[PDB]
Design a protein around this ligand. Sequence first.
Ligand SMILES: CN1CCN(C(=O)Cc2c[nH]c3ncccc23)CC1
Ligand SMILES: CN1CCN(C(=O)Cc2c[nH]c3ncccc23)CC1
Lengths: 304, 304
Amino acid sequence: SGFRKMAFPSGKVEGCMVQVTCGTTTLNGLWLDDVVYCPRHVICTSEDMLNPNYEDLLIRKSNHNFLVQAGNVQLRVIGHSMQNCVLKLKVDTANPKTPKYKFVRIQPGQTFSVLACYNGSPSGVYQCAMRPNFTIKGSFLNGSCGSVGFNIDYDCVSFCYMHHMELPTGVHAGTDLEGNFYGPFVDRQTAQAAGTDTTITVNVLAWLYAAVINGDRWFLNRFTTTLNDFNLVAMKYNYEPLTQDHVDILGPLSAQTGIAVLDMCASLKELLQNGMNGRTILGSALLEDEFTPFDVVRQCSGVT
Amino acid sequence: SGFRKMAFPSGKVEGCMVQVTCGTTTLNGLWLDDVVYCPRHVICTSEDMLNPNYEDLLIRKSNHNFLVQAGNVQLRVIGHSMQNCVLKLKVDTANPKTPKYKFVRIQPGQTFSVLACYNGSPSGVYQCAMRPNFTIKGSFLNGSCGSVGFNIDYDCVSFCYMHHMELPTGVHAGTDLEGNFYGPFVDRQTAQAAGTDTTITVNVLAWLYAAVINGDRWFLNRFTTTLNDFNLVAMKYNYEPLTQDHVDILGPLSAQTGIAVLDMCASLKELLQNGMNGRTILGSALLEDEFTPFDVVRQCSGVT
Ligand SMILES: CN1CCN(C(=O)Cc2c[nH]c3ncccc23)CC1
Ligand SMILES: CN1CCN(C(=O)Cc2c[nH]c3ncccc23)CC1
């Protein structure tokens, strides 16, 4: 019993973190096999950051300009390339701690763990969601760039995020491990505004199910709704529309609790309309949207 | 920028987790040097759990009755002893992944990371606080016993908690690594009620400072208070009393923000009296009390 914002165990990823220095800038890199992945803005001066031409800046850089340190031992760089917004530094040594891994590009609403790192050393781990506006609400200070987001399936680390920048609103933007930004963001020091940060409705419903499973049931009501009726209310409250694909994904939680998805939607509808009236659900005074239905089943079943 | 409930990187602890089986019960153990630490209730049948005499039950157990598996390799048990509520199984092999470590008994209000484990395998990591009633609000299912709470200082893991049981209210009780329960709890399947779960005032104030540092300032007011005046209000709201030791610990956050501790107390006083009025602080609709002043400085400074 109990329900916590839970991160994946970070050890498999800790074993991949290194320090990358180009000139006076140090940030983090991800060492998998004989490649080190890092944000391309490592090559930029503060001046360059305002309006960088990365291809032109990169011409001035050689393998020996990329200093890669794994613990307190230097790796030899034997190649470099730019893929979208990441640099791939080929090193002469395969990371001996390379886990089974994939690179995945996640959808908005998907959660992942972040291993916040500075100078290639882990500082902490927390759980994030890719927001519907393709930002993440992380905890990142200068030097945290190259920190990675990931999910784990038994022994396979799926890398989904690499940290690149903070927007002037203090929300975070980054890439997949192919170097493609989530959302419309660019690695340039220019004011970039985020769109509407809507609530991840299917995740809220997952968390309401988690609440029921954990004995927090006060919000269960006598009502039902329809997807169309629910969605009118969702749109009014800047909630993402619910689709039958969302209802399908909530099936196992529906079956475990015996609460029809549309009934739980009607409960959610009343919470939106009435608020919490000073009550809490799983120790929260707001509706939590950074647990996926998969997250709730995993936590509630004890997958390792 | 941004402020997250952040756990320590768990890799150093992942390397210590093993599976302990006695008869038909499997739970987790902590392998440090040539000792495996686990809850003594591993020796109990369901029947035994109702009113166990652990010394008498342990007489019936030999070294070869304790099955210790590290990954998928069995460890040879060459000794066993009971220290308070934990068993110490001496094995013939030092854990090669043993980190620098200490055993510490934490105070109520102190935070720690939990590596939730099942069958000696990590499932996830989250941040907890020792509640003033000596419970923790964890996320633990059957098989999670022997999971450990810890803090890390650079390269030294301080182990502070080992999970033993859930109370009928679904809150959690456990021991330090000398086997002494936090609070009045006993490892027996008998109804045990928790006392008042008061709010950790110094932690709320730490988190308000964290909010100011991160640009959430709407709650800063024109008022000040005194420790005695604040404490009258604290007691009314089931907040822990604030002492000058708490004010001392908040000094660095006071200095960083230029907000006198007693001014922040007066802000907190108004939040208690007025509530949040549907507003949030660091994405929370309630006052968060599971960040210590040390946690806030660490996260806000990027210690690795
Ligand atoms: C292209 N350019 C954009 C601006 N940059 C950052 O925002 C880096 C960064 C990521 N998280 C942070 N948190 C606090 C302060 C700075 C950062 C550098 C790269
Ligand atoms: C002395 N006896 C007391 C009762 N026990 C537990 O509560 C073990 C336990 C710890 N977390 C849990 N979460 C869910 C279900 C069970 C547990 C066994 C030991």
